[PDB]
């Protein structure tokens, strides 16, 4: 139940650490495969998968992108409507707010429909 | 014949073929049943296990996956191999490669990871398909449901060396001295060609030196004539 | 900071290039699943033939195109297949008095040089009094052009000198 900014701040360093571990496991797996395919047997030890790491890194990246996208959409939809009405919630009553919003939607739809009909009738 | 084995009663290499009369599952029992001692020829097993033995390790899986997809718009799909003798040779190869992987840790891969013993399950499936293929019997039940299950390990996209044809059917053709007219796993294929790449008559396209140490048996087998493709050919990068 | 992959890829000197495939391609093919990531078909015999086999150095052709309708150049019995490539006969047909055409044999058209040839200087310029004065100032003016250019620069300098010494 944290804020999106808090989730971003707590995801970024885990993201960096996941990237570091990804590079490390990739290097280890690559050097093991090379020593087992080019030179002599030296890396006789169980290595990681390098896939369970990259999948988790991609998951962290995607989750951070989704959190930031949600925050951006929230701030955008809160900014455009803040400049269209005052604040009134537990300066204005709720039924009047609903009626004003309905009238605004109706007027915008009417303008759009009139413009579309005129543009279609133009040709 | 690669076996530089110890003394035996009669042709220790033939025991891998006589192993046909064995149990179905748990190859670990079959190997103790047949033989386990005289199957180590060179400590430098790191010659063909990782590079060459991956072929059979992927081909067994591609053959197992091709079974529940008979509905594909092709009679065998990619391949069918319902004769049984080839399947028996495949099982023998699986036994000897299991012995190899027991001797040295450079076995065929689990193809990703997380088989709890991927070789055991692959061998169980091979034997379940092989039992009703041996001598004049019907073929597949539970096998069709088991092959439907895919572990977190199964790759695809195998080489399957094929050869382009020359379909000058019945009328005429008009080529040029150059400007071709449109109408193998031992490494041998990086992302972009950066070696000799001595192609062959049909499909091979194997490198000339091969950059190896002790697998020159295949090289000597392939330098001369080939599977109707002895006309080896050099193609630039 | 994570220089491990960099130093390992740098250490990987040997010629055998199959470890990177077997090490990376499985993961990418598992995550990214394109049966044909580049489904476009590419079968190309690029070069069929590219030569006109009749072209003189193209750089000179540009200048002969940029010439004014007053000027007009041609070719004499030509030791100019590809190397000299020019010794022309440019008659300065204009409004003012005409003159004798020069040769102006130039070097390879890359032009780390200029044209001036001065072939018919002997009999043409000494014969006439006006033509004698034409040569005089024109030589001094051509001894000023820093790295003059074959057609446009030298031809315009010749015309300017011819119509300036005219007074």
Distance CA A19, CA C4 (A): 12
| Residue C33 touches chain A, beta carbons under 8 Å | no
Q: Which residues are paired to C17 by β-bridges?
A: none
C-alpha distances in Å from residue B131, one per residue of B99, B151, B152, C78: 22, 24, 27, 91
Query: Which residues have C-beta within 8 Å of that of residue C72, sequence separation ≥ 6?
Result: C90, C91, C93
What does the block give as tokens for A12?
Answer: 């970024």
Phi, psi of B108 (to 5 degrees): -70, 145
Distance CA C37, CA C45 (A): 23
Distance CA B199, CA B236 (A): 10
The answer to whether the CB of C129 falls within 8 A of the CB of C158 is no
Looking up tokens 């398909």 gives: B129
Looking up tokens 């009139």 gives: A114
CB atoms within 10 A of CB C57: 18
Resolution (A): 4.0
Q: Which long-range contacts (CB under 8 A, 24 or more apart) does C135-141 make?
A: C136/C165, C137/C161, C137/C164, C137/C165, C138/C162, C138/C165
Looking up tokens 């293929």 gives: B133
Distance CA B16, CA B216 (A): 24
| Residue B115 touches chain A, beta carbons under 8 Å | no
What does the block give as tokens for A21?
Answer: 């571990």
Structure obtained using: cryo-EM
The answer to whether the CB of B35 falls within 8 A of the CB of B12 is yes
The answer to whether the CB of B117 falls within 8 A of the CB of B110 is no
Name every chain C residue with its beta carbon within 8 A of the beta carbon of B156: 29
How far away is chain A from the Cα of B113, in angstroms, using its nearest Cα?
Answer: 7
How far away is chain A from the Cα of B28, in angstroms, using its nearest Cα?
Answer: 22
Query: Count of A–C CB contacts within 8 Å?
Result: 46
CA proximity to B51, closest of B128, B124, B116, B108: B108
Q: Considering only the beta carbons, identify the residue of C14, C18, C30 that sits closest to A51.
A: C30
How far away is chain B from the Cα of A13, in angstroms, using its nearest Cα?
Answer: 29
Which chains does chain C touch, 3 or more C-beta pairs < 8 A? A, B
C-alpha distances in Å from residue A107, one per residue of A95, A101, A120: 18, 10, 20
Distance CA A80, CA B79 (A): 62
CB atoms within 10 A of CB C53: 5
Distance CA B207, CA C128 (A): 81
CA proximity to C110, closest of C85, C144, C142, C78: C85
């Amino acid at each position: 139940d944290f804020d999106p900014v808090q989730r971003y701040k707590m995801l970024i360093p885990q993201l960096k650490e996941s990237l570091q571990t990804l590079m490390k496991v990739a290097a280890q797996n690559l050097i093991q495969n090379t020593n087992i395919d080019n030179g002599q047997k030296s890396s006789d030890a169980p290595l990681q998968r390098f896939d369970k790491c990259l999948e988790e890194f991609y998951a962290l990246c995607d989750q951070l992108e989704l959190c930031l996208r949600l925050a951006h959409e929230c701030l955008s939809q809160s900014c455009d409507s803040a400049k269209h009405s005052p604040t009134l919630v537990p300066s204005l009553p709720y039924p009047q707010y609903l009626a004003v919003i309905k009238a605004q939607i109706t007027c915008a739809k009417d303008i759009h429909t009139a413009l579309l009909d005129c543009a279609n009738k133009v040709t | 014949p690669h076996f530089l084995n110890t003394p035996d009663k009669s042709p220790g290499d033939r025991l891998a073929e006589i192993c046909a009369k064995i149990t179905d599952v748990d190859i670990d029992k079959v190997m103790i049943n047949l033989k386990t001692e005289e199957f180590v020829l060179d400590m430098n097993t790191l010659q063909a296990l990782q590079q060459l033995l991956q072929w059979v390790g992927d081909f067994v899986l591609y053959l197992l996956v091709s079974l529940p997809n008979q509905g594909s718009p092709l009679r065998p799909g990619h391949s069918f191999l319902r004769d049984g003798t080839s399947l028996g040779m495949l099982r023998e190869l699986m036994v000897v490669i299991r012995i190899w992987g027991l001797l040295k840790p450079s076995c065929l891969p689990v193809y990703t990871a997380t088989s709890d013993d991927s070789m055991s399950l692959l061998f169980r499936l091979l034997t379940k398909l092989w039992i009703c293929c041996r001598d004049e019997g019907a073929a597949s039940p539970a096998s069709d449901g088991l092959v439907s299950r895919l572990q977190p390990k199964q790759p695809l996209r195998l080489r399957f060396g094929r050869a382009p044809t020359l379909p000058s059917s019945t009328s005429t053709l008009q080529l040029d001295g150059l400007t071709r007219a449109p109408g193998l796993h031992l490494g041998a294929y990086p992302t972009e060609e950066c070696k000799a790449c001595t192609r062959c008559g049909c499909v091979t396209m194997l490198k000339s030196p091969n950059k190896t140490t002790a697998v020159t048996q295949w090289e000597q087998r392939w330098i001369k004539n080939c599977l109707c493709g002895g006309l080896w050919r050099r193609v630039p990068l | 900071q994570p220089l491990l992959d960099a130093v390992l890829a740098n250490i990987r000197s040997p010629v055998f290039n199959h470890s990177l495939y077997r090490t990376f391609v499985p993961a990418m093919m598992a995550i990214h699943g394109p049966p044909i990531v580049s489904p476009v078909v590419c079968s190309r015999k690029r070069r069929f033939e590219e030569d006109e086999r009749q072209s003189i150095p193209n750089v000179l052709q540009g200048e002969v195109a940029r010439l004014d309708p007053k000027f007009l150049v041609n070719l004499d019995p030509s030791h100019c297949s590809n190397n000299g490539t020019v010794h022309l006969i440019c008659k300065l047909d204009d409004k003012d008095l005409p003159s004798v055409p020069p040769l102006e044999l130039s070097v390879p058209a890359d032009y780390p040089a200029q044209s001036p040839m001065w072939i018919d200087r002997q009999w043409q310029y000494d014969a006439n009094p006006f033509l004698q004065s034409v040569h005089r100032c024109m030589t001094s003016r051509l001894l000023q052009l820093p790295d003059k250019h074959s057609v446009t620069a030298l031809l315009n300098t010749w015309a300017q000198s011819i119509h300036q010494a005219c007074l």
